[PDB]
Design an enzyme around this catalytic site. Structure first.
Site, PDB file in Angstrom:
ATOM      1  N   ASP A 145      21.084  25.278 -35.524  1.00  0.00           N
ATOM      2  CA  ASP A 145      21.140  24.320 -36.621  1.00  0.00           C
ATOM      3  C   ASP A 145      22.563  23.957 -37.034  1.00  0.00           C
ATOM      4  O   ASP A 145      22.736  23.246 -38.033  1.00  0.00           O
ATOM      5  CB  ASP A 145      20.377  24.859 -37.838  1.00  0.00           C
ATOM      6  CG  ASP A 145      21.143  25.939 -38.573  1.00  0.00           C
ATOM      7  OD1 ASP A 145      21.652  26.866 -37.906  1.00  0.00           O
ATOM      8  OD2 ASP A 145      21.238  25.865 -39.816  1.00  0.00           O
ATOM      9  N   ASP A 165      19.677  30.726 -32.780  1.00  0.00           N
ATOM     10  CA  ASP A 165      20.664  31.200 -33.739  1.00  0.00           C
ATOM     11  C   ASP A 165      19.999  32.087 -34.786  1.00  0.00           C
ATOM     12  O   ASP A 165      18.797  31.986 -35.045  1.00  0.00           O
ATOM     13  CB  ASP A 165      21.362  30.019 -34.413  1.00  0.00           C
ATOM     14  CG  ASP A 165      22.640  30.422 -35.123  1.00  0.00           C
ATOM     15  OD1 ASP A 165      23.285  31.397 -34.681  1.00  0.00           O
ATOM     16  OD2 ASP A 165      22.999  29.766 -36.122  1.00  0.00           O
ATOM     17  N   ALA A 179       0.803  -1.218   0.000  1.00  0.00           N
ATOM     18  CA  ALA A 179       0.000   0.000   0.000  1.00  0.00           C
ATOM     19  C   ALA A 179       0.838   1.272   0.000  1.00  0.00           C
ATOM     20  O   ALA A 179       0.286   2.353  -0.233  1.00  0.00           O
ATOM     21  CB  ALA A 179      -0.942   0.005   1.205  1.00  0.00           C
ATOM     22  N   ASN A 225      -5.259  -0.325  -7.486  1.00  0.00           N
ATOM     23  CA  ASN A 225      -4.333   0.702  -7.953  1.00  0.00           C
ATOM     24  C   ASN A 225      -4.073   0.602  -9.452  1.00  0.00           C
ATOM     25  O   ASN A 225      -4.027   1.624 -10.146  1.00  0.00           O
ATOM     26  CB  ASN A 225      -3.020   0.612  -7.177  1.00  0.00           C
ATOM     27  CG  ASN A 225      -3.018   1.474  -5.929  1.00  0.00           C
ATOM     28  OD1 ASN A 225      -3.338   2.661  -5.981  1.00  0.00           O
ATOM     29  ND2 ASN A 225      -2.656   0.878  -4.799  1.00  0.00           N
TER      30      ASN A 225
HETATM   31  F1  ALF Z   1      25.310  32.235 -36.842  1.00  0.00           F
HETATM   32 AL1  ALF Z   1      25.541  30.604 -36.153  1.00  0.00          AL
HETATM   33  F2  ALF Z   1      25.773  28.974 -35.464  1.00  0.00           F
HETATM   34  F3  ALF Z   1      26.268  31.326 -34.691  1.00  0.00           F
HETATM   35  F4  ALF Z   1      24.813  29.883 -37.614  1.00  0.00           F
HETATM   36 MG   LIG Z   2      23.073  28.402 -37.927  1.00  0.00          MG
END
Ligand code: ALF
Ligand SMILES: [Mg+2]
Length: 893
Positions: free
Chosen positions: A630, A336, A290, A724
């Site tokens: 990216d 970015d 329990a 349960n």
């Molecule tokens: F402008 Al960057 F990684 F800093 F694409």
């Molecule tokens: Mg970039």
């Protein structure tokens, strides 16, 4: 005693070629012999990256088994199986296996497979040894080796360039931008060597050579280079535990400590009075079963997976549950600019003419969408001669060709082609026949062609040149103003330079264009401003995110001017924002860095180490950052951050495999929807966690009160497990998928240091547990005859507990809202769960084999009415408490 010291990229950049060769003891012409390279490799090791090995899945299963709750459950199971209770032991082990399987599935690694980082490295390299150019693998390279670079050849290691002719190297692996940086052989001053991008005399590992040929001497291999440092940082960095996971761990450890103390004091008080050892062991197994809520992790995993699938329907791929859950309550967002904010497509935005007119160009990308406006008037074709001449010069003197929205050639040339196409002059280049071509070189920085009109060949030859303003203006002698050709004066050059400086200060790339009969007698038309514009709809999304509770930061790979311009376009550099470079970031103390990070939002020329340091500083004071990128440096930044948001169909494979969420058809409204879904999932998780905790502690204290007050065990392990797992599951899942309110998607995100259990929540949990315990104890005492466990008594207790749990779940479906406003069968999943639970209880009560298994009798209509009427007592007081707190809020408002 040949012992080569580690020559850093900066120190090698400062040192001329002679001293670099002398220190490395490297022959620039004949190269190295096999004995010396063998000895150096024996010292410095191989030029290879070790990805090492991970741990097998069975070790993870054992580690998940190593939870104190799992030890307690296993001890209870072994005690049960040692007492001829094989059915209870089998049920307990089945529940344990289900719990660990669910926990492993929820906490399963997202299959990083981070070997993509060790793939932007050439398998072979053209090295020179003993005066002979040999084809050898890059893994055999060592500092001091001479490496020849060609077009399409990836740089295998850090090279000190001593010979280079028009060498352009793609450095989108450490900077993240597809702008070929010109490479030279002269040493660089220490003043300008702050940033990696300024190292024009160093060839970095992992970079691709776009044009030209060069020879370099290896100054670093493996883990002692820029790419080596990036690999070290990525390998040594792990995803931090989410605040949800930390809160769950704290709750689990608190529950384990409380259960251990409770069972210890229960055993002590039982031994003080004197009880049979068999009954003591049975009671201990009862409290052990329990004490652990088995269905809570299962419900959490199921509801989080359902939310993940729902967001997948909303174009958002999710691989791990808790990371997206804590992203749903994130505070800071870092993205970015080159690869995420801007679409990495140069576009002309400003046009300046010799006469002095300023033209603004709309539209983004290499498409005809967009208009060129002058003084608020849209100009098409040859409507304005001044702008049309510049467009013609940029169009005919252009080697770039745009096919089906994909550019083949230099991005700046593609910008001019797109500008010409937007004006309706997409076919102007075919109207001219080029006779002589002068190319674009890093030594000259200007491009010119001699062409004559196709249908008017007898017209005199006309020359068009484009290039840098400083070099173009030399060949310019006249300029056109309001259709009249005037001689170039020093004041005209001054105002042109002022305009060029103004455009450069706005982050725009300045390109000069001129035309005339022969070189040296050309006429200056004007300048064009080329920048990387942000995507469409990005500004509105950024404003919506920043409006409520998010403070969006910015990390940029370009210089200060471009970052400032992009932030001003988005709105992050309005009047008082500041820009800090990576050298400044590494200059001050970590305390000063943590003081300076929150008051700034623009970062320019940031290395992967700089991004990691910024992320760590942001997370130091306590926050949930959402890093977005990216590139490879971006990928390292996402790895450092708890949540990783990547870019779909436009980013590198390393970033995609090192992130958590893949954003196909890159949008930020998807991020907002994910945040709202995470907030709703967190609210539902709190709701059903509160319900399950209330039920668990209610059962525990009910068994404890029964033991202290001297009645036998009312419920065994099988009954508690059945309550349960099988029947308390679907109601909790329905609560997890309960529709959200309009006040949940709103409000700023909650602070990460809070706990799921609050004072009011725990008070309501305790009140509900007390009511359930009182009802169950009253039923058990009423239906007990001479301290004999009757099957009718067991059936009544089971049905009463089932009804009380169902009504507690119904009351805990929502808080501060009651059930009248939401209405019954709002989602019909709770109704289905209640119907299934009722059918299961009826089957347990009536089905003969189920009766024999559960040791239960048959109930009557009067007993059912009694149990239904008595159960609703908790609901009335729950609604009374809800009305009381509603009135308190109303009078406080
Ligand atoms: F402008 Al960057 F990684 F800093 F694409
Ligand atoms: Mg970039």
């Amino acid at each position: 005693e040949t012992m080569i010291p580690v020559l850093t990229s900066k120190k090698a950049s400062e040192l001329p070629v002679s001293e670099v060769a002398s220190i490395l003891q490297a022959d620039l012409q004949n190269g190295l012999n096999k004995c010396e390279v063998s000895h150096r490799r024996a010292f410095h090791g191989w030029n290879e990256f070790d990805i090492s090995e991970d741990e097998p899945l069975w070790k993870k299963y054992i580690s998940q088994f190593k939870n104190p709750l799992i030890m307690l459950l296993l001890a209870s199971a072994v005690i049960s199986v040692l007492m001829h209770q094989f059915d209870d032991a089998v049920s307990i082990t089945v529940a344990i296996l289900i719990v660990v399987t669910v926990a492993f599935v929820q906490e399963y690694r997202s299959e990083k497979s981070l070997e993509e980082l060790s793939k932007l490295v050439p398998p072979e390299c053209h090295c020179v040894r003993e005066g002979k150019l040999e084809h050898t693998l890059a893994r055999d390279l060592v500092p001091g080796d001479t490496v020849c670079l060609s077009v399409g050849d990836r740089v295998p290691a850090d090279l000190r360039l001593f010979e280079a002719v028009d060498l352009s190297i793609d450095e989108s692996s450490l900077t993240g931008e597809t702008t070929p940086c010109s490479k030279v052989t002269a040493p660089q001053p220490a003043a300008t060597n702050g940033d990696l991008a300024s190292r024009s005399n160093i060839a970095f590992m992992g970079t691709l050579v776009r044009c030209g040929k060069a020879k370099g001497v290896v100054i670093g291999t493996g883990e002692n280079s820029e790419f080596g440092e990036v690999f070290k940082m990525m390998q040594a960095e792990e995803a931090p535990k989410t605040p949800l996971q930390k809160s769950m761990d704290l709750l689990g450890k608190q529950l384990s400590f409380y259960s251990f103390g409770i069972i210890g004091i229960i055993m002590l008080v039982g031994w003080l009075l004197g009880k049979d050892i068999l009954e003591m062991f049975t009671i201990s197994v009862s409290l052990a079963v329990a004490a652990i809520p088995e269905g809570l992790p299962i419900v959490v995993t199921v509801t989080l997976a359902l939310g993940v699938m729902r967001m997948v329907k909303k174009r958002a791929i999710v691989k791990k549950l808790p990371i997206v859950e804590t992203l749903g309550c994130c505070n800071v967002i870092c993205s970015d600019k080159t690869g995420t904010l801007t679409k990495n497509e140069m576009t002309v935005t400003h046009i300046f003419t010799s006469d002095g007119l300023h033209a603004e160009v709309t539209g983004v990308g290499y498409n005809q969408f967009g208009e060129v406006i002058v003084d608020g008037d849209v100009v098409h074709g040859f409507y304005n001669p001044a702008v049309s001449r510049i467009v013609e010069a940029g169009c005919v003197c252009n080697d770039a060709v745009i096919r089906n929205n994909t550019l083949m050639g230099k991005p700046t040339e593609g910008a001019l082609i797109a500008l010409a196409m937007k004006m309706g002059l997409d076919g102007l280049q075919q109207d001219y026949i080029r006779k002589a071509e002068y190319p674009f070189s890093s030594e000259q920085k200007w491009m010119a062609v001699k062409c004559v009109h196709r249908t008017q060949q007898d017209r005199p030859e006309i020359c068009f040149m484009k290039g840098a303003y400083e070099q173009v203006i030399k060949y310019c002698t006249t300029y056109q103003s309001k259709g009249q050709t005037l001689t170039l004066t020093q004041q005209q050059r001054d105002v042109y330079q002022q305009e060029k400086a103004r455009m450069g200060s706005a982050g725009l790339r300045v390109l000069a264009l001129a035309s005339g009969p022969e070189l040296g007698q050309l006429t200056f038309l004007g300048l064009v401003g080329i920048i990387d514009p942000p995507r469409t709809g990005v500004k509105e999304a950024v404003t919506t995110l920043i409006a409520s509770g998010v403070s969006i930061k910015m990390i940029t790979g370009d210089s200060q001017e471009t970052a400032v311009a992009i932030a001003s376009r988005l709105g992050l550099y309005s009047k008082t924002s500041q820009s800090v470079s990576g050298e400044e970031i590494d200059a001050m103390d970590v305390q000063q860095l943590s003081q300076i990070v929150p008051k700034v939002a623009v970062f320019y020329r940031a290395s992967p180490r700089h991004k990691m340091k910024i992320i760590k500083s942001l997370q130091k004071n306590g926050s949930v950052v959402a890093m977005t990128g990216d590139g490879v440096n971006d990928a390292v930044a996402l790895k450092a951050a708890d949540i990783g948001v990547a870019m779909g169909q436009t980013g590198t494979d390393v970033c995609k495999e090192a992130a958590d969420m893949i954003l196909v058809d890159d949008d930020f409204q998807t991020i907002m929807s994910a945040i709202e879904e995470g907030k709703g999932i967190y609210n539902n998780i709190k709701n059903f966690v509160r319900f399950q905790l209330s039920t668990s502690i209610a059962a525990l204290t009910l068994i404890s009160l029964a033991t202290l007050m001297n009645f036998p065990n009312p419920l065994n392990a099988m009954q508690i497990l059945w309550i349960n797992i099988i029947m308390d599951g679907p109601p909790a899942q329905s609560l997890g998928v309960e529709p959200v309110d309009k006040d949940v998607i709103r409000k700023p995100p909650r602070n990460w240091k809070d706990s799921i259990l609050t004072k009011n929540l725990i008070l309501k949990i305790l009140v509900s547990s007390i009511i359930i315990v009182c009802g169950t104890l009253f039923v058990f005492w009423r239906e007990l005859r001479d301290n004999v466990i009757t099957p009718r008594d067991t059936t009544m207790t089971f049905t009463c507990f089932v009804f009380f749990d169902m009504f507690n779940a119904l009351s805990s479906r929502s808080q501060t809202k009651s059930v009248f406003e939401i209405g019954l069968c709002s989602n019909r999943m709770f109704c289905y769960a209640v119907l299934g639970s009722i059918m299961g209880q009826l089957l347990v009560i009536y089905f003969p084999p189920l009766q024999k298994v559960f040791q239960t009798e048959s109930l009557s209509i009067l007993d059912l009415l009694f149990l239904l009427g008595l159960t609703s007592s908790v609901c009335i007081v729950a609604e009374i408490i809800k009305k009381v707190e509603r009135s308190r809020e109303k009078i406080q408002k």
